[PDB]
Coordinates of C-alpha atoms and ligand atoms in Angstrom, one line a residue:
Chain H
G53 CA 24.2 54.3 -21.4
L54 CA 20.5 53.8 -21.4
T55 CA 18.5 56.8 -22.5
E56 CA 16.2 58.4 -20.0
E57 CA 13.0 57.1 -21.6
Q58 CA 14.5 53.6 -21.8
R59 CA 15.1 53.6 -18.0
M60 CA 11.4 54.5 -17.6
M61 CA 10.5 51.7 -20.1
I62 CA 12.3 49.0 -18.0
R63 CA 10.9 50.5 -14.8
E64 CA 7.3 50.1 -15.9
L65 CA 7.9 46.5 -17.1
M66 CA 9.7 45.7 -13.8
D67 CA 6.8 47.4 -12.0
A68 CA 4.2 45.3 -13.9
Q69 CA 6.2 42.1 -13.2
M70 CA 6.4 42.9 -9.5
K71 CA 2.7 43.6 -9.3
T72 CA 1.4 40.6 -11.2
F73 CA 4.0 37.7 -10.8
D74 CA 3.3 35.8 -7.5
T75 CA 6.7 34.1 -7.4
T76 CA 5.6 32.0 -4.3
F77 CA 2.3 30.9 -6.0
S78 CA 0.7 31.7 -2.7
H79 CA -2.7 32.4 -4.3
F80 CA -2.7 29.2 -6.5
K81 CA -5.3 27.2 -4.6
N82 CA -8.5 25.1 -5.1
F83 CA -6.8 23.3 -7.9
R84 CA -7.7 19.8 -9.0
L85 CA -5.4 16.8 -8.3
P86 CA -5.2 13.3 -9.7
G87 CA -7.7 11.0 -8.1
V88 CA -6.7 8.5 -5.5
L89 CA -6.5 4.7 -6.2
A90 CA -7.2 5.5 -33.5
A91 CA -4.2 7.1 -35.1
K92 CA -5.3 10.2 -33.2
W93 CA -4.7 8.3 -30.0
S94 CA -1.3 7.1 -31.1
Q95 CA -0.3 10.8 -31.6
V96 CA -2.0 12.1 -28.4
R97 CA 0.0 9.3 -26.6
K98 CA 3.3 10.6 -28.1
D99 CA 2.3 14.2 -27.2
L100 CA 2.1 13.5 -23.5
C101 CA 4.9 11.0 -22.8
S102 CA 7.8 13.5 -23.4
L103 CA 6.3 16.0 -20.9
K104 CA 5.9 13.7 -17.9
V105 CA 6.5 15.1 -14.4
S106 CA 5.9 14.0 -10.8
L107 CA 4.2 16.4 -8.3
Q108 CA 5.1 17.3 -4.8
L109 CA 2.9 19.3 -2.4
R110 CA 4.5 20.8 0.7
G111 CA 2.0 21.7 3.4
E112 CA 2.1 24.6 5.8
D113 CA 2.3 22.1 8.7
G114 CA 5.3 20.4 7.2
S115 CA 3.5 17.5 5.6
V116 CA 4.5 16.4 2.1
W117 CA 2.3 14.8 -0.6
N118 CA 4.0 13.2 -3.6
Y119 CA 2.4 12.1 -6.8
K120 CA 4.1 9.7 -9.2
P121 CA 2.3 9.5 -12.6
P122 CA 1.4 6.1 -14.1
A123 CA 3.1 4.5 -17.1
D124 CA 1.3 4.4 -20.4
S125 CA -0.7 1.2 -20.6
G126 CA -3.0 2.1 -23.4
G127 CA -5.8 3.9 -21.5
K128 CA -7.1 7.1 -20.1
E129 CA -4.5 7.1 -17.3
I130 CA -2.3 9.4 -19.4
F131 CA -4.8 12.2 -18.8
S132 CA -4.6 12.0 -14.9
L133 CA -2.6 15.2 -14.6
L134 CA -4.5 17.2 -17.2
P135 CA -7.1 18.8 -14.9
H136 CA -4.3 20.0 -12.6
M137 CA -2.1 21.3 -15.4
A138 CA -5.1 23.2 -16.8
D139 CA -5.6 24.8 -13.4
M140 CA -1.9 25.8 -13.2
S141 CA -1.9 27.1 -16.8
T142 CA -5.1 29.1 -16.1
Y143 CA -3.6 30.6 -13.0
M144 CA -0.5 31.5 -14.9
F145 CA -2.5 32.9 -17.8
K146 CA -4.4 35.2 -15.4
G147 CA -1.1 36.7 -14.1
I148 CA 0.1 37.2 -17.7
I149 CA -3.2 39.0 -18.6
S150 CA -2.8 41.2 -15.5
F151 CA 0.8 41.8 -16.5
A152 CA -0.2 43.2 -19.9
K153 CA -3.1 45.4 -18.6
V154 CA -0.7 47.3 -16.3
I155 CA 1.7 48.2 -19.2
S156 CA 0.8 51.6 -20.6
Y157 CA 2.1 50.6 -24.1
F158 CA -0.5 47.8 -24.0
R159 CA -3.5 49.7 -22.6
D160 CA -3.2 52.3 -25.3
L161 CA -3.7 49.8 -28.1
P162 CA -7.3 49.1 -29.2
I163 CA -8.9 46.4 -27.0
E164 CA -9.4 44.0 -29.9
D165 CA -5.7 44.2 -30.6
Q166 CA -5.0 43.6 -26.9
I167 CA -7.0 40.3 -27.2
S168 CA -5.2 39.3 -30.4
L169 CA -1.8 39.9 -28.8
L170 CA -2.7 38.1 -25.6
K171 CA -4.1 35.1 -27.6
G172 CA -0.9 34.8 -29.5
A173 CA 1.7 35.3 -26.8
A174 CA 0.1 34.2 -23.5
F175 CA 1.7 30.8 -23.7
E176 CA 5.1 32.3 -24.4
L177 CA 5.0 34.7 -21.5
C178 CA 3.9 31.9 -19.3
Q179 CA 6.9 29.8 -20.3
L180 CA 9.3 32.7 -19.7
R181 CA 7.9 33.1 -16.1
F182 CA 8.2 29.4 -15.5
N183 CA 11.9 29.5 -16.6
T184 CA 12.7 31.8 -13.7
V185 CA 11.5 29.1 -11.2
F186 CA 13.1 26.2 -13.2
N187 CA 15.9 24.4 -11.4
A188 CA 18.2 23.0 -14.2
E189 CA 20.3 21.1 -11.7
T190 CA 17.3 19.0 -10.5
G191 CA 15.0 19.4 -13.5
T192 CA 12.2 20.8 -11.3
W193 CA 9.9 23.8 -11.6
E194 CA 9.8 25.1 -8.0
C195 CA 6.4 26.8 -7.7
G196 CA 6.4 27.8 -4.1
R197 CA 4.7 24.9 -2.3
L198 CA 4.4 22.9 -5.5
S199 CA 7.2 21.2 -7.3
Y200 CA 7.1 19.6 -10.8
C201 CA 10.0 17.3 -11.2
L202 CA 10.9 15.8 -14.6
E203 CA 10.6 12.0 -14.4
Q204 CA 19.4 13.5 -21.4
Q205 CA 17.1 12.0 -23.9
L206 CA 14.5 14.5 -22.5
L207 CA 16.5 17.4 -24.1
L208 CA 15.2 16.1 -27.5
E209 CA 11.8 17.6 -26.5
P210 CA 12.0 21.3 -27.7
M211 CA 10.2 22.6 -24.6
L212 CA 12.6 21.0 -22.2
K213 CA 15.6 22.0 -24.3
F214 CA 14.3 25.6 -24.3
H215 CA 14.2 25.8 -20.5
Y216 CA 17.6 24.3 -20.1
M217 CA 19.2 26.5 -22.7
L218 CA 17.5 29.7 -21.6
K219 CA 18.3 29.1 -17.9
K220 CA 22.0 28.8 -18.8
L221 CA 22.3 32.4 -20.2
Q222 CA 21.7 33.4 -16.5
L223 CA 19.6 36.4 -17.4
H224 CA 18.6 39.2 -15.1
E225 CA 15.1 40.0 -14.0
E226 CA 15.2 43.0 -16.4
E227 CA 16.1 40.8 -19.3
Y228 CA 13.3 38.3 -18.6
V229 CA 10.7 41.0 -18.5
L230 CA 12.0 42.6 -21.7
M231 CA 11.7 39.1 -23.4
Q232 CA 8.1 39.1 -22.2
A233 CA 7.5 42.5 -23.8
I234 CA 9.1 41.6 -27.1
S235 CA 7.0 38.4 -27.2
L236 CA 3.8 40.2 -26.2
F237 CA 4.2 42.9 -28.8
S238 CA 4.8 40.6 -31.8
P239 CA 3.1 42.4 -34.7
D240 CA 2.4 39.3 -36.8
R241 CA -0.1 37.4 -34.6
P242 CA -3.5 36.5 -36.1
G243 CA -6.0 39.4 -36.0
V244 CA -3.6 42.3 -35.2
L245 CA -4.8 45.5 -36.9
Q246 CA -2.3 48.1 -35.7
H247 CA 0.7 46.1 -37.0
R248 CA 2.6 49.4 -37.6
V249 CA 2.1 50.6 -34.0
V250 CA 3.0 47.2 -32.5
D251 CA 6.0 46.8 -34.8
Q252 CA 7.8 50.0 -33.6
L253 CA 6.7 49.2 -30.0
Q254 CA 8.5 45.8 -30.3
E255 CA 11.5 47.5 -31.9
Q256 CA 11.9 49.9 -29.0
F257 CA 11.7 46.9 -26.5
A258 CA 14.4 45.1 -28.5
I259 CA 16.6 48.3 -28.7
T260 CA 16.2 48.7 -24.9
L261 CA 17.2 45.1 -24.3
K262 CA 20.2 45.5 -26.7
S263 CA 21.3 48.7 -24.9
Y264 CA 20.8 47.1 -21.5
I265 CA 23.1 44.2 -22.3
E266 CA 25.7 46.5 -23.8
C267 CA 25.7 48.7 -20.7
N268 CA 25.6 46.1 -17.9
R269 CA 27.3 43.0 -19.4
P270 CA 30.9 43.6 -20.5
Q271 CA 32.2 40.0 -20.0
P272 CA 33.3 37.9 -22.9
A273 CA 30.8 35.2 -22.0
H274 CA 28.0 37.6 -22.8
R275 CA 29.2 38.4 -26.3
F276 CA 26.2 38.1 -28.8
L277 CA 23.9 37.6 -25.8
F278 CA 21.2 39.9 -27.4
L279 CA 21.3 37.8 -30.5
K280 CA 21.2 34.6 -28.4
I281 CA 18.1 35.9 -26.6
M282 CA 16.4 36.9 -29.9
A283 CA 17.0 33.4 -31.3
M284 CA 15.5 32.0 -28.1
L285 CA 12.4 34.1 -28.7
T286 CA 12.1 32.7 -32.3
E287 CA 12.4 29.2 -30.9
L288 CA 9.7 30.0 -28.2
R289 CA 7.4 31.1 -31.0
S290 CA 7.9 27.8 -32.7
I291 CA 7.3 25.9 -29.5
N292 CA 4.1 27.9 -29.0
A293 CA 2.9 26.8 -32.4
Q294 CA 3.6 23.1 -31.9
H295 CA 2.2 23.2 -28.4
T296 CA -1.1 24.7 -29.6
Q297 CA -1.4 21.8 -32.0
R298 CA -0.8 19.3 -29.1
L299 CA -3.4 20.9 -26.9
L300 CA -6.1 20.9 -29.7
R301 CA -5.4 17.3 -30.4
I302 CA -5.8 16.3 -26.8
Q303 CA -8.9 18.5 -26.5
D304 CA -10.4 16.6 -29.4
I305 CA -10.5 13.2 -27.6
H306 CA -10.3 14.3 -24.0
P307 CA -11.7 17.8 -23.1
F308 CA -9.7 19.5 -20.3
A309 CA -9.4 23.2 -21.3
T310 CA -10.8 25.6 -18.8
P311 CA -13.1 28.5 -20.0
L312 CA -10.1 30.9 -20.0
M313 CA -8.0 28.4 -22.0
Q314 CA -11.0 28.0 -24.4
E315 CA -11.1 31.8 -24.9
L316 CA -7.4 32.1 -25.5
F317 CA -7.4 29.2 -28.0
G318 CA -10.5 30.3 -29.9
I319 CA -12.8 27.5 -28.7
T320 CA -16.4 28.8 -28.9
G321 CA -18.2 26.0 -27.0
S322 CA -20.4 25.1 -30.0
Chain T
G181 CA -4.4 -35.9 17.4
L182 CA -7.2 -33.3 17.2
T183 CA -10.6 -34.7 18.2
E184 CA -13.3 -34.8 15.6
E185 CA -15.2 -31.9 17.1
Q186 CA -12.0 -29.8 17.4
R187 CA -11.4 -30.1 13.7
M188 CA -15.0 -28.8 13.1
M189 CA -14.2 -26.0 15.5
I190 CA -11.1 -24.9 13.6
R191 CA -13.0 -25.3 10.3
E192 CA -15.8 -23.0 11.3
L193 CA -13.3 -20.3 12.5
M194 CA -11.3 -20.6 9.3
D195 CA -14.5 -20.4 7.4
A196 CA -15.6 -17.3 9.1
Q197 CA -12.1 -15.8 8.6
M198 CA -12.2 -16.6 4.9
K199 CA -15.7 -15.0 4.5
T200 CA -15.1 -11.8 6.5
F201 CA -11.4 -10.9 6.2
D202 CA -10.7 -9.0 2.9
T203 CA -7.0 -9.5 2.9
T204 CA -6.6 -7.2 -0.1
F205 CA -8.7 -4.4 1.4
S206 CA -10.4 -4.2 -2.0
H207 CA -13.6 -2.8 -0.5
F208 CA -11.9 -0.2 1.7
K209 CA -12.8 2.9 -0.2
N210 CA -14.3 6.4 0.1
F211 CA -12.0 7.0 3.0
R212 CA -10.8 10.4 4.1
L213 CA -7.3 11.6 3.6
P214 CA -5.2 14.4 5.1
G215 CA -5.8 17.8 3.4
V216 CA -3.5 19.2 0.8
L217 CA -1.3 22.2 1.6
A218 CA -3.4 22.3 28.8
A219 CA -1.9 19.3 30.6
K220 CA -4.5 17.4 28.6
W221 CA -2.8 18.6 25.4
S222 CA 0.7 17.6 26.6
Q223 CA -0.6 14.1 27.1
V224 CA -2.6 13.9 23.8
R225 CA 0.6 15.0 22.2
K226 CA 2.6 12.1 23.8
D227 CA -0.2 9.7 22.8
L228 CA 0.2 10.4 19.1
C229 CA 3.9 10.8 18.5
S230 CA 4.9 7.2 19.2
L231 CA 2.4 5.8 16.6
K232 CA 3.5 7.9 13.7
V233 CA 3.3 6.5 10.2
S234 CA 3.6 7.6 6.6
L235 CA 0.9 6.6 4.0
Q236 CA 1.3 5.3 0.4
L237 CA -1.6 4.9 -2.0
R238 CA -0.9 2.7 -5.1
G239 CA -3.4 3.3 -7.9
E240 CA -4.8 0.8 -10.3
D241 CA -3.2 2.7 -13.2
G242 CA 0.2 2.5 -11.6
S243 CA 0.3 5.9 -10.0
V244 CA 1.5 6.3 -6.4
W245 CA 0.5 8.9 -3.8
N246 CA 2.7 9.2 -0.7
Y247 CA 1.9 11.2 2.4
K248 CA 4.5 12.2 5.0
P249 CA 3.0 13.4 8.3
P250 CA 4.2 16.7 9.8
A251 CA 6.4 17.1 12.8
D252 CA 4.8 18.3 16.1
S253 CA 4.9 22.1 16.2
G254 CA 2.3 22.7 19.0
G255 CA -0.8 22.7 16.9
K256 CA -3.7 20.8 15.4
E257 CA -1.5 19.3 12.7
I258 CA -0.9 16.1 14.9
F259 CA -4.6 15.3 14.1
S260 CA -4.1 15.3 10.3
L261 CA -4.3 11.5 10.0
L262 CA -7.1 10.9 12.5
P263 CA -10.1 11.0 10.0
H264 CA -8.3 8.5 7.8
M265 CA -7.4 6.2 10.7
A266 CA -10.9 6.3 12.0
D267 CA -12.1 5.2 8.5
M268 CA -9.6 2.3 8.5
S269 CA -10.5 1.3 12.0
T270 CA -14.2 1.4 11.2
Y271 CA -13.7 -0.7 8.1
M272 CA -11.8 -3.2 10.2
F273 CA -14.3 -3.2 13.0
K274 CA -17.0 -4.1 10.4
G275 CA -15.1 -7.1 9.3
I276 CA -14.6 -8.2 12.9
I277 CA -18.3 -7.8 13.7
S278 CA -19.1 -9.9 10.6
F279 CA -16.5 -12.5 11.7
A280 CA -18.3 -12.9 15.0
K281 CA -21.8 -13.1 13.6
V282 CA -20.8 -16.1 11.4
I283 CA -19.5 -18.2 14.3
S284 CA -22.2 -20.5 15.7
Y285 CA -20.7 -20.3 19.2
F286 CA -21.3 -16.5 19.0
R287 CA -24.8 -16.4 17.5
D288 CA -26.1 -18.8 20.2
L289 CA -25.2 -16.3 23.0
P290 CA -27.8 -13.7 23.9
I291 CA -27.6 -10.6 21.8
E292 CA -26.7 -8.3 24.7
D293 CA -23.8 -10.6 25.5
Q294 CA -22.7 -10.5 21.9
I295 CA -22.6 -6.7 22.1
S296 CA -20.6 -6.8 25.4
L297 CA -18.1 -9.3 23.9
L298 CA -17.7 -7.2 20.7
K299 CA -17.3 -4.0 22.6
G300 CA -14.5 -5.5 24.7
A301 CA -12.6 -7.4 22.1
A302 CA -13.1 -5.6 18.7
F303 CA -9.8 -3.7 19.0
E304 CA -7.9 -6.9 19.9
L305 CA -9.2 -8.9 16.9
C306 CA -8.5 -5.9 14.7
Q307 CA -4.9 -5.9 15.9
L308 CA -4.6 -9.6 15.3
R309 CA -5.8 -9.3 11.7
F310 CA -3.4 -6.3 11.2
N311 CA -0.5 -8.5 12.4
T312 CA -1.0 -10.9 9.5
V313 CA -0.3 -8.0 7.0
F314 CA 2.5 -6.5 9.1
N315 CA 6.0 -6.6 7.4
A316 CA 8.5 -6.7 10.3
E317 CA 11.4 -6.3 7.9
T318 CA 10.2 -2.9 6.7
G319 CA 7.9 -1.9 9.6
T320 CA 4.9 -1.5 7.2
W321 CA 1.3 -2.7 7.4
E322 CA 0.6 -3.7 3.8
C323 CA -3.1 -3.3 3.4
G324 CA -3.5 -4.1 -0.3
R325 CA -3.2 -0.8 -2.2
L326 CA -2.5 1.1 1.1
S327 CA 0.8 0.9 3.0
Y328 CA 1.4 2.3 6.5
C329 CA 5.1 2.6 7.1
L330 CA 6.5 3.4 10.6
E331 CA 8.4 6.7 10.4
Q332 CA 14.5 0.6 17.7
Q333 CA 13.4 3.2 20.2
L334 CA 9.9 2.5 18.6
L335 CA 9.8 -0.9 20.2
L336 CA 9.4 0.9 23.5
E337 CA 5.8 1.5 22.4
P338 CA 3.8 -1.6 23.6
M339 CA 1.7 -1.7 20.4
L340 CA 4.7 -1.8 18.1
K341 CA 6.6 -4.3 20.3
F342 CA 3.4 -6.5 20.2
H343 CA 3.4 -6.6 16.4
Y344 CA 7.1 -7.4 16.2
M345 CA 7.0 -10.1 18.9
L346 CA 3.8 -11.7 17.6
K347 CA 5.0 -11.8 14.0
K348 CA 8.2 -13.6 15.0
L349 CA 6.4 -16.7 16.3
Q350 CA 5.5 -17.2 12.7
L351 CA 2.0 -18.5 13.4
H352 CA -0.3 -20.3 11.0
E353 CA -3.6 -19.0 9.8
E354 CA -5.3 -21.5 12.2
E355 CA -3.4 -20.2 15.2
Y356 CA -4.3 -16.5 14.4
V357 CA -8.0 -17.3 14.1
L358 CA -7.9 -19.3 17.4
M359 CA -6.3 -16.3 19.0
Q360 CA -9.2 -14.2 17.7
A361 CA -11.6 -16.7 19.2
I362 CA -10.0 -16.7 22.6
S363 CA -9.9 -12.9 22.7
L364 CA -13.5 -12.6 21.5
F365 CA -14.8 -15.1 24.1
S366 CA -13.2 -13.5 27.2
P367 CA -15.7 -14.0 30.0
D368 CA -14.6 -11.0 32.0
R369 CA -15.6 -8.0 29.8
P370 CA -17.9 -5.3 31.2
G371 CA -21.5 -6.3 30.9
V372 CA -21.2 -10.1 30.2
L373 CA -24.0 -12.0 31.8
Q374 CA -23.4 -15.7 30.7
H375 CA -19.9 -15.7 32.1
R376 CA -20.2 -19.4 32.7
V377 CA -21.1 -20.2 29.1
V378 CA -18.4 -17.9 27.7
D379 CA -15.8 -19.3 30.1
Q380 CA -16.1 -22.9 29.0
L381 CA -16.3 -21.7 25.4
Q382 CA -13.0 -19.9 25.7
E383 CA -11.5 -22.9 27.4
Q384 CA -12.4 -25.2 24.5
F385 CA -10.8 -22.7 22.1
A386 CA -7.6 -22.7 24.2
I387 CA -7.6 -26.5 24.4
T388 CA -8.0 -26.7 20.7
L389 CA -5.1 -24.3 20.1
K390 CA -3.0 -26.2 22.6
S391 CA -3.8 -29.5 20.8
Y392 CA -3.2 -28.0 17.4
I393 CA 0.3 -26.9 18.3
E394 CA 1.1 -30.2 19.9
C395 CA 0.0 -32.1 16.8
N396 CA 1.5 -29.9 14.1
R397 CA 4.6 -28.3 15.7
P398 CA 7.2 -30.7 16.9
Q399 CA 10.3 -28.5 16.5
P400 CA 12.3 -27.4 19.5
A401 CA 11.7 -23.8 18.4
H402 CA 8.0 -24.2 19.2
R403 CA 8.4 -25.5 22.7
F404 CA 6.1 -23.5 25.0
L405 CA 4.5 -21.8 22.0
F406 CA 1.0 -22.2 23.4
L407 CA 2.1 -20.5 26.6
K408 CA 3.9 -17.8 24.5
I409 CA 0.6 -17.1 22.6
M410 CA -1.4 -17.0 25.8
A411 CA 1.0 -14.4 27.2
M412 CA 0.6 -12.4 24.0
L413 CA -3.1 -12.4 24.5
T414 CA -2.8 -11.1 28.0
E415 CA -0.5 -8.3 26.7
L416 CA -3.0 -7.5 23.9
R417 CA -5.7 -7.1 26.6
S418 CA -3.4 -4.6 28.4
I419 CA -2.7 -2.8 25.1
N420 CA -6.5 -2.7 24.5
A421 CA -7.0 -1.0 27.9
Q422 CA -4.4 1.7 27.4
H423 CA -5.4 2.3 23.8
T424 CA -9.0 2.9 24.9
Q425 CA -7.7 5.6 27.3
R426 CA -5.7 7.2 24.5
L427 CA -8.7 7.4 22.2
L428 CA -11.0 8.9 24.9
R429 CA -8.4 11.5 25.7
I430 CA -8.0 12.5 22.0
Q431 CA -11.8 12.4 21.6
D432 CA -12.1 14.8 24.5
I433 CA -10.2 17.7 22.7
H434 CA -10.6 16.6 19.1
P435 CA -13.6 14.5 18.1
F436 CA -12.8 12.0 15.4
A437 CA -14.7 8.8 16.3
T438 CA -17.1 7.5 13.7
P439 CA -20.6 6.5 14.8
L440 CA -19.5 2.8 14.9
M441 CA -16.5 3.7 17.0
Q442 CA -18.8 5.7 19.3
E443 CA -21.1 2.7 19.7
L444 CA -18.2 0.3 20.5
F445 CA -16.6 2.8 23.0
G446 CA -19.9 3.6 24.8
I447 CA -20.2 7.2 23.5
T448 CA -23.9 8.2 23.5
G449 CA -23.7 11.5 21.6
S450 CA -25.2 13.5 24.5
Ligands
LIG171 C1 -1.1 23.0 -20.9 C2 -0.2 22.1 -21.3 C3 -0.1 20.7 -20.9 C4 0.4 19.8 -22.1 O1 -1.4 20.2 -20.4 C5 0.9 20.5 -19.7 C6 2.3 21.1 -19.9 C7 3.2 21.1 -18.7 C8 3.5 22.5 -18.1 C9 4.3 23.4 -19.1 C10 2.2 23.2 -17.8 C11 2.4 24.5 -17.0 C12 3.1 24.2 -15.7 C13 4.4 23.4 -15.8 C14 4.8 22.9 -14.4 C15 5.5 24.5 -16.2 C16 4.3 22.2 -16.8 C17 5.6 21.4 -17.0 C18 5.2 20.0 -17.5 C19 4.4 20.1 -18.8 C20 5.3 20.3 -20.0 O2 3.8 18.8 -19.0
LIG172 C1 -7.7 4.3 16.3 C2 -6.5 4.5 16.7 C3 -5.6 5.6 16.3 C4 -4.8 6.1 17.5 O1 -6.3 6.7 15.8 C5 -4.6 5.1 15.2 C6 -3.8 3.9 15.5 C7 -3.0 3.4 14.2 C8 -3.5 2.0 13.7 C9 -3.3 0.9 14.7 C10 -4.9 2.2 13.3 C11 -5.5 1.0 12.5 C12 -4.7 0.9 11.2 C13 -3.2 0.7 11.4 C14 -2.5 0.9 10.0 C15 -2.9 -0.7 11.8 C16 -2.7 1.8 12.3 C17 -1.2 1.8 12.6 C18 -0.7 3.1 13.2 C19 -1.5 3.6 14.4 C20 -0.9 2.9 15.7 O2 -1.2 5.0 14.6

């Protein structure tokens, strides 16, 4: 059974998730949309083609807008969805930042450790929240009135393979929010000072997740599930590192990062 | 055979059509689009539902936007496409006005007869030009990078039955432009003073059309084609009258007419 203080730990995480995760994306608004009607470039081109999606906008009246992205023809058209994706990423980053500020274990860390942990894990927590709205049967992220549909060679892309593999473990809401906590409290992010405090905090979150699975998942299909989840978190950290490199390469030739993204990625504006 | 001065008549009409009809709609731009995300009303509701279309925007890069209109739920949502349609109608009206100003038979009329003829026939010439880009097999008006697809009970709507019936006569470009001339030079529009001059001008255009068909269409399928075209022009005049009533009813509860539309429909702004 879960100890008393582990139940309180899950409850506060679930509470923060309920307060800061707008599952309907109802307040995602005023976002940009695609307009109507050398070796660096070769690599920026490869960075974007494997993450191509179409976009659908369902209106409150019942109207539907659908956007199909263009094929790569050797021009700026591969950047048509970057302003919108920056707006969605920024909205998601804001929810992740609010999620961390509610958690007591996070407020009690020094503020300049809070910034270091958020800078290192904001992308990972965003991907974990996006997995809960991912439809693996249709390959679409269903974000309330917005839908991002992927245009099985796509599973070669580690980000897409991550979302398909994670969705198939069929995790509970409690397991997702504990994954967010373990990723957020990674002691070994750049600039973390209280690595000792963050380490034992992460260990308690992992122990709680381990005990949660052992108490609520007896089926043979969930054997080694905790170890499967931990391996997924290691893969997500790797995806976070390669995705940061992609963003910085695209930012080099075609700026698109919002001020909040610039802050999280260390861009000073000079 | 066509007389010498009839050949010159067709040539000037064809010349004006070539100069003023942008068949690719390349200069139709900066138009509005639907936003993203009592007994008068009952009749304004019936006026709009039978003319419902979806909208597709093909970009130069290869991207495609598609708009599906909402169903009627008893609200303002039936007016979502009115600003765009007013922009398309205004662009088409401008081409029709430029078409008339090139024709010598039109410039030589007094200017306040030119305004009366344009006020009475601008809608009809617009519909005739739209028929040349109508695809009866798909029910879509293919306007270059824009496509307006109709959402056979629709043939009950006289405007849609007109476009299907006219397209099936498979008229030449010369026959279309002569239809435009006969409609433009209708002597019996409100405010026409030189009804005698306009009458014999229209008669010459009809005689030229009659002679054109007799000289270039010997096939049994084109028997009575001139009489079929003349009957279509009478039907178009009737459609013009009922459509003016629809527009004025919609303008009463939901203003949408551009300044050019207001001028053509006699709205003073007071
Ligand atoms: C900020 C990152 C990028 C490269 O500019 C866009 C990544 C984007 C992203 C993960 C961005 C966040 C929203 C959502 C719908 C989950 C998409 C799925 C499609 C993908 C992978 O292209
Ligand atoms: C100005 C008139 C209206 C009522 O506001 C719109 C009419 C509109 C119209 C004839 C307007 C001109 C362009 C095009 C694509 C031919 C459409 C076809 C669909 C239809 C019939 O709804």
